[PDB]
Design a protein around this motif. Structure first.
Motif, PDB file in Angstrom:
ATOM      1  N   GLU A  18      50.179  21.087  16.249  1.00 59.28           N
ATOM      2  CA  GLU A  18      51.189  20.371  15.493  1.00 59.28           C
ATOM      3  C   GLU A  18      51.989  19.559  16.494  1.00 59.28           C
ATOM      4  OE1 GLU A  18      53.575  23.813  13.613  1.00 59.28           O
ATOM      5  OE2 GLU A  18      52.003  23.636  12.098  1.00 59.28           O
ATOM      6  N   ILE A  49      48.113  28.802  11.295  1.00 56.31           N
ATOM      7  CA  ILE A  49      48.511  27.598  10.587  1.00 56.31           C
ATOM      8  C   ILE A  49      49.620  27.968   9.598  1.00 56.31           C
ATOM      9  CG2 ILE A  49      46.541  27.938   8.929  1.00 56.31           C
ATOM     10  CD1 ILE A  49      46.148  24.793   9.220  1.00 56.31           C
ATOM     11  N   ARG A  50      50.747  27.243   9.652  1.00 57.36           N
ATOM     12  CA  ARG A  50      51.871  27.583   8.789  1.00 57.36           C
ATOM     13  C   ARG A  50      51.439  27.529   7.328  1.00 57.36           C
ATOM     14  NH1 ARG A  50      56.576  24.296   9.879  1.00 57.36           N
ATOM     15  NH2 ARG A  50      55.774  23.493  11.867  1.00 57.36           N
ATOM     16  N   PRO A  83      52.096  26.633   3.270  1.00 56.14           N
ATOM     17  CA  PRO A  83      52.715  25.479   2.608  1.00 56.14           C
ATOM     18  C   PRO A  83      54.062  25.857   2.021  1.00 56.14           C
ATOM     19  CG  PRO A  83      50.776  26.236   1.364  1.00 56.14           C
ATOM     20  CD  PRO A  83      50.798  26.998   2.678  1.00 56.14           C
ATOM     21  N   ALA A  98      72.524  22.586   2.062  1.00 59.52           N
ATOM     22  CA  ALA A  98      71.951  23.478   3.064  1.00 59.52           C
ATOM     23  C   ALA A  98      72.501  24.888   2.919  1.00 59.52           C
ATOM     24  CB  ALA A  98      72.217  22.940   4.473  1.00 59.52           C
ATOM     25  N   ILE A 152      63.981  26.370   5.145  1.00 61.86           N
ATOM     26  CA  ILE A 152      63.765  24.927   5.211  1.00 61.86           C
ATOM     27  C   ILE A 152      62.608  24.670   6.155  1.00 61.86           C
ATOM     28  CG2 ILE A 152      64.729  22.685   5.716  1.00 61.86           C
ATOM     29  CD1 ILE A 152      67.385  23.527   5.039  1.00 61.86           C
ATOM     30  N   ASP A 153      61.562  24.023   5.659  1.00 65.51           N
ATOM     31  CA  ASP A 153      60.360  23.795   6.455  1.00 65.51           C
ATOM     32  C   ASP A 153      60.300  22.404   7.073  1.00 65.51           C
ATOM     33  OD1 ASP A 153      59.637  26.365   5.529  1.00 65.51           O
ATOM     34  OD2 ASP A 153      58.514  25.563   3.829  1.00 65.51           O
ATOM     35  N   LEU A 154      60.882  21.404   6.419  1.00 67.77           N
ATOM     36  CA  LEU A 154      60.870  20.043   6.926  1.00 67.77           C
ATOM     37  C   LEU A 154      62.010  19.296   6.235  1.00 67.77           C
ATOM     38  CD1 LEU A 154      58.803  17.453   8.101  1.00 67.77           C
ATOM     39  CD2 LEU A 154      57.953  17.612   5.776  1.00 67.77           C
ATOM     40  N   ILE A 155      62.635  18.380   6.964  1.00 63.80           N
ATOM     41  CA  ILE A 155      63.549  17.427   6.363  1.00 63.80           C
ATOM     42  C   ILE A 155      63.122  16.052   6.834  1.00 63.80           C
ATOM     43  CG2 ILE A 155      65.982  16.789   5.848  1.00 63.80           C
ATOM     44  CD1 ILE A 155      66.857  19.480   6.662  1.00 63.80           C
ATOM     45  N   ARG A 156      62.941  15.142   5.897  1.00 64.68           N
ATOM     46  CA  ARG A 156      62.597  13.785   6.260  1.00 64.68           C
ATOM     47  C   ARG A 156      63.403  12.868   5.361  1.00 64.68           C
ATOM     48  NH1 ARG A 156      56.979  11.477   3.756  1.00 64.68           N
ATOM     49  NH2 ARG A 156      57.299  12.118   1.573  1.00 64.68           N
ATOM     50  N   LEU A 166      66.821  11.844   0.888  1.00 66.70           N
ATOM     51  CA  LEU A 166      66.397  12.892   1.802  1.00 66.70           C
ATOM     52  C   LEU A 166      65.571  13.909   1.022  1.00 66.70           C
ATOM     53  CD1 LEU A 166      69.878  13.374   3.700  1.00 66.70           C
ATOM     54  CD2 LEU A 166      67.941  11.932   4.428  1.00 66.70           C
ATOM     55  N   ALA A 213      72.898  24.174   8.421  1.00 64.70           N
ATOM     56  CA  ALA A 213      74.178  24.243   7.727  1.00 64.70           C
ATOM     57  C   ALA A 213      75.344  24.031   8.690  1.00 64.70           C
ATOM     58  CB  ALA A 213      74.304  25.584   7.008  1.00 64.70           C
ATOM     59  N   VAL A 241      67.865  11.892   8.153  1.00 64.84           N
ATOM     60  CA  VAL A 241      67.793  13.241   8.697  1.00 64.84           C
ATOM     61  C   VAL A 241      66.328  13.617   8.773  1.00 64.84           C
ATOM     62  CG1 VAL A 241      68.304  15.684   8.396  1.00 64.84           C
ATOM     63  CG2 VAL A 241      70.008  13.939   7.766  1.00 64.84           C
ATOM     64  N   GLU A 242      65.883  14.056   9.941  1.00 62.08           N
ATOM     65  CA  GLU A 242      64.543  14.595  10.072  1.00 62.08           C
ATOM     66  C   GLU A 242      64.671  15.903  10.829  1.00 62.08           C
ATOM     67  OE1 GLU A 242      62.430  11.299  12.470  1.00 62.08           O
ATOM     68  OE2 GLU A 242      62.141  10.480  10.460  1.00 62.08           O
ATOM     69  N   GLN A 243      64.079  16.968  10.298  1.00 63.48           N
ATOM     70  CA  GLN A 243      64.042  18.235  11.022  1.00 63.48           C
ATOM     71  C   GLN A 243      62.699  18.929  10.805  1.00 63.48           C
ATOM     72  OE1 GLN A 243      67.307  21.151  10.304  1.00 63.48           O
ATOM     73  NE2 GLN A 243      65.741  22.581   9.473  1.00 63.48           N
ATOM     74  N   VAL A 244      62.262  19.658  11.833  1.00 65.08           N
ATOM     75  CA  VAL A 244      61.048  20.458  11.766  1.00 65.08           C
ATOM     76  C   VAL A 244      61.181  21.569  12.801  1.00 65.08           C
ATOM     77  CG1 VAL A 244      59.593  19.298  13.525  1.00 65.08           C
ATOM     78  CG2 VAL A 244      58.553  20.205  11.378  1.00 65.08           C
ATOM     79  N   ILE A 263      58.452  23.626  15.064  1.00 62.92           N
ATOM     80  CA  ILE A 263      57.086  23.819  15.550  1.00 62.92           C
ATOM     81  C   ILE A 263      57.136  24.939  16.589  1.00 62.92           C
ATOM     82  CG2 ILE A 263      55.237  22.788  16.933  1.00 62.92           C
ATOM     83  CD1 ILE A 263      56.470  20.023  15.525  1.00 62.92           C
ATOM     84  N   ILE A 274      50.728  15.320  14.115  1.00 65.33           N
ATOM     85  CA  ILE A 274      49.513  16.111  14.146  1.00 65.33           C
ATOM     86  C   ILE A 274      49.829  17.427  13.465  1.00 65.33           C
ATOM     87  CG2 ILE A 274      47.538  16.994  15.528  1.00 65.33           C
ATOM     88  CD1 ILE A 274      48.246  15.150  17.712  1.00 65.33           C
ATOM     89  N   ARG A 275      49.008  17.801  12.504  1.00 63.50           N
ATOM     90  CA  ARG A 275      49.195  19.075  11.843  1.00 63.50           C
ATOM     91  C   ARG A 275      47.819  19.687  11.664  1.00 63.50           C
ATOM     92  NH1 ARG A 275      50.054  18.838   5.335  1.00 63.50           N
ATOM     93  NH2 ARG A 275      48.309  17.435   4.819  1.00 63.50           N
TER      94      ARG A 275
END
Ligand SMILES: O=C(NO)Nc1ccc(Cl)cc1Cl
Ligand SMILES: O=C(NO)Nc1ccc(Cl)cc1Cl
Ligand SMILES: [Cl-]
Ligand SMILES: [Cl-]
Ligand SMILES: [Mg+2]
Ligand SMILES: [Mg+2]
Lengths: 396, 396
Positions: free
Chosen positions: A36, A88-89, A91, A112, A122-126, A136, B19, B35-38, B40, B125-126
């Motif tokens: 990833e 692999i995480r 879904p 949040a 929370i797995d992803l924020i885009r 968002l 938060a 906002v983007e968060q992940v 890995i 990449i995932r």
């Protein structure tokens, strides 16, 4: 290969890190189990779960090759013999959309917090849009059962903080929607056609009062239709065409339909308004389905009555099933968008029910609510980003 | 708010960072632009592009609140007055799938190198699967025009390094595919039905030699069909049912169809084989469309001839258009999966052409090729992850 090793590179993005790291790994016994990588604001994370001989995993050579190559160019690198780490995480169970103009940090923090309270990860924020509204997305993993409680929290957050907040199931099935119906008046089209008609009779006042009461759930829709259309008694049928020509689409309506055609949606409208107005636009917009009421006419004059079955609240749901039957789409893959109590049954029967700048009666029952005068914010709730719309539109 | 500020948090993931950061920002004039968060491998990146008064942006209070809160709990935080920084990243132009059993670091490095050579940027990449095959996805941004050159590089990489590598357009349009046709023999179904039939006549030898020549592009498909079916002259028609019962689905075939039904696909088969065998399975598999050849029968005995139009190479394409016409799906949203030269025209007419454990003649023309004896790897090329398949399957 015997055992698994985890290699995590982080730091300021640079060209060629990805290639370099996999050249190094190839000098050892290395097979990839998972990879990833992402760059967020020039911050690189590269997570490589790897399969190599126990010979190679617990020897300093592998570690030293990687550590030297990564650190030389200004990044950091971790190397831990995992073995018991997930490959692999899993879904996300749900996705949460936040639209605002603006979205305050307070608004987002409340989301949040409500999320973190219920045990929702929370797995992803885009970002899905910078225009016309800031949008968002939070892909989340919701503990079994908290589905319901989380929608309520976020509905309280929504209104307290002045953002739209919608929670959708992020499953394979519930994602491949394929049919959308729009209410016409104050949804696909600005204003109320019956008010535009009632004006030609000098009745726009009474007619708009009754429409407000009907759309708020104050009056039966059938009686309200009959009372308002009655004010048209005596107008020449010529007025239908005129009102037709005055119609302004909802901002983003055209963008919305074009984008939905790109995704393969069947598209129709279901209104308590009048087929003779709606059909011109249904054709112009290359729509697949139109259900609508019908003005009675006698010697080229309107009588004040509508004909046949009145498409009432229940009749709007009936029409969506007709449409979804004719289209071979299961109700769970259907989308209904409406603004009034006229629409409560439609939305509730649809797989996704979207209240659009809607009276409280409809918001209370809707799957999701939109508060901004742009119909294309419907797209964002259907997994479409602004940039994707702009890219496809550019191609043409 | 006057000006934009970028706030980038990184470090070891911990509960509640998201938060906490937005509570702090709410104590200032802060509105969110992006906002983007992940996370890995327990590495958190949180990138927050923000809108606040020039009063607040260039004062130490904002910086100090954030810096104190983030560092207290063991993370790092950046704060830079951006203003000229993009708000929301642009979408990838393409996505690249890498499947292998195994995928060596060498294989993946070659992909990464071929990519980086052409000026193609890697956006994400995932992992899309750990089973039955290791599957990786690269969302990429391909410079205009390099589309073609990149597919060739990755085809060279594919064969040199023993992984499947497919480059797909990652646009809104080309993504919402909706119709898939499978070749039957050695695609949806193990083996060749004509060889199973030819066995009952003691002709399996000659028949399998001719089938090999036909599927490799050595012989005209019409003549090869006529020569092989002729070896059946004199068999009782009872043998059709028997061979029907011997059929083994391709591994993952059932998973493939079930998953495609979940996505709303229309599904059919297009074979040069025999409708009387294929129709039993077409029904069992709840298929939407079957095009197939027809064995001639006389007093309950086969003659050695087929009837009517032979579905030849061109006839397989014709059938897919029939199917996509009956189904109202534009050819660009269609998927064809085949293994033989019998299939070259089908694949080439389809929006996505997938060669499946296919002779060289078909791989050379296909949009993508799969090398592993699992038909569900077709799913991975259609944007489906293993975990999504497992999750939806679990629900039931
Ligand atoms: O759709 C509506 N508001 O959102 N209003 C409405 C419009 C025309 C007619 Cl004939 C009847 C009604 Cl109830
Ligand atoms: O599909 C095939 N191979 O992949 N082979 C084939 C099978 C049955 C018949 Cl009748 C004719 C042919 Cl050419
Ligand atoms: Cl009418
Ligand atoms: Cl037959
Ligand atoms: Mg309405
Ligand atoms: Mg075949």
């Amino acid at each position: 290969p015997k055992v698994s090793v985890l290699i995590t590179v982080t730091g300021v993005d640079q060209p060629g890190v990805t290639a370099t790291l996999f050249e190094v790994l190839s000098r050892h016994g290395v097979e990839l189990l998972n990879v990833e990588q992402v760059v967020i604001r020039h911050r690189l994370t590269l997570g490589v779960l790897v399969c190599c001989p126990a010979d190679v995993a617990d020897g300093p050579a592998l570690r030293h090759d990687v550590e030297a190559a990564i650190r030389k160019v200004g990044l950091d690198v971790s190397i831990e013999r995992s073995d018991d780490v997930p490959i692999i995480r899993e879904p996300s169970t749900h996705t949460i959309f936040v639209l605002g103009r603006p979205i305050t940090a307070a608004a987002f923090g409340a989301v949040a917090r409500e999320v973190a309270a219920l045990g929702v990860n929370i797995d992803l924020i885009r970002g899905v849009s910078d225009y016309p509204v800031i949008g968002l997305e939070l892909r989340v993993s919701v503990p079994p059962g908290a589905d319901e409680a989380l929608r309520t929290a976020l509905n309280r957050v929504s209104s307290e903080e002045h953002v739209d907040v919608a929670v959708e199931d992020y499953t394979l099935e519930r994602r491949a929607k394929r049919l959308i119906v729009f209410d016409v008046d104050s949804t696909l089209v600005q204003g109320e056609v019956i008010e535009m008609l009632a004006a030609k009779a000098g009745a726009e006042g009474q007619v708009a009062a009754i429409t407000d009461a009907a759309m708020r759930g104050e009056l039966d829709f059938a009686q309200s239709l009959q009372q308002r259309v009655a004010t048209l008694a005596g107008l020449p049928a010529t007025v239908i065409d005129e009102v037709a020509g005055q119609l302004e689409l909802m901002p983003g309506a055209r963008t919305t339909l074009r984008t939905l055609r790109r995704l393969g949606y069947a598209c129709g409208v279901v209104s308590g308004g009048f087929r003779r107005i709606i059909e011109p636009l249904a054709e112009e917009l290359m729509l697949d389905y139109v259900a609508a009421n019908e003005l009675e006419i006698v010697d080229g004059t309107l009588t004040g009555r509508v004909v046949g079955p009145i498409i009432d609240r229940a009749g709007k749901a009936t029409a969506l099933r007709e449409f979804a039957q004719r289209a071979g789409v299961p109700m769970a893959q259907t989308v209904a968008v409406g603004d009034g109590a006229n629409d409560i049954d439609m939305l509730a029967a649809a797989g996704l029910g979207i209240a659009f700048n809607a009276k409280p009666a409809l918001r209370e029952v809707a799957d999701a609510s939109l508060s901004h005068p742009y119909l294309d914010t419907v797209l964002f709730l259907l997994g479409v980003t602004r940039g994707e719309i702009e890219a496809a539109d550019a191609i043409d």
